[PDB]
């Protein structure tokens with residue numbers, strides 16, 4: 001029997017695709033509206049939504065067109081993590097990019113941590129999927145991942161926060177907003193993992209992907225816009 005939740009998530013994957021495609025085009029069109037020194041801010045933001053767009057395009061093949069639960073296949077975990085592996089670092093660079101051999105140590109710390117977080121997650125999810133339920137590898141990977149994540153938040157609310165003050169108001173204020181994305185917006189994913197780790201089922205997975213879809217829109221388009229307006233405001 002055809003499933004309404006399945007049809008719904010099929011639709012939402014298109015929403016992700018179109019939202020990401022549209023953000024991508026916005027950033028690319030408004031790039032020359034920027035001083036030549038700020039254009040990289042738009043390009044990096046566009047590259048991220050672009051990657052997420054390709055991710056959401058290929059989700060169409062994971063669910064399929066059937067509407068049947070049992071028809072759900074593909075490699076949606078790999079698709080999502082390859083997206084995450086590329087986009088999360090490209091999102092984190094927006095911090096030292098707004099700041100300015102003086103923003104490179106911060107960047108280096110951000111990305112090592114981020115890489116530990118993402119691949120930890122991948123190892124854990126893959127183990128959970130293969131077993132069809134809780135594994136301790138699934139638990140410890142996660143915890144290590146969360147540690148990396150908390151380390152990132154620490155840098156943003158200390159290192160980044162302090163350097164922010166030495167920047168012009170609209171850049172400083174953007175940087176301070178951006179932090180909350182990583183603290184609150186990014187919290188959605190490890191929460192979704194926790195549910196997955198302790199509550200198996202295809203349907204709950206579809207719901208997590210739904211929520212991730214909104215998280216992503218916020219954390220990629222939203223987060224990109226914030227930084228883009230600062231560099232346009234400071235382009236006068």
Ligand SMILES: *C/C=C(C)/C=C/C=C(C)/C=C/C1=C(C)CCCC1(C)C
Nearest residue numbers: 121142145146149186189190193219
């Ligand atoms: C655009 C995609 C984004 C912003 C994805 C962010 C992903 C995370 C913040 C992942 C977090 C995880 C942990 C904090 C612990 C280990 C499990 C991970 C992958 C889910």
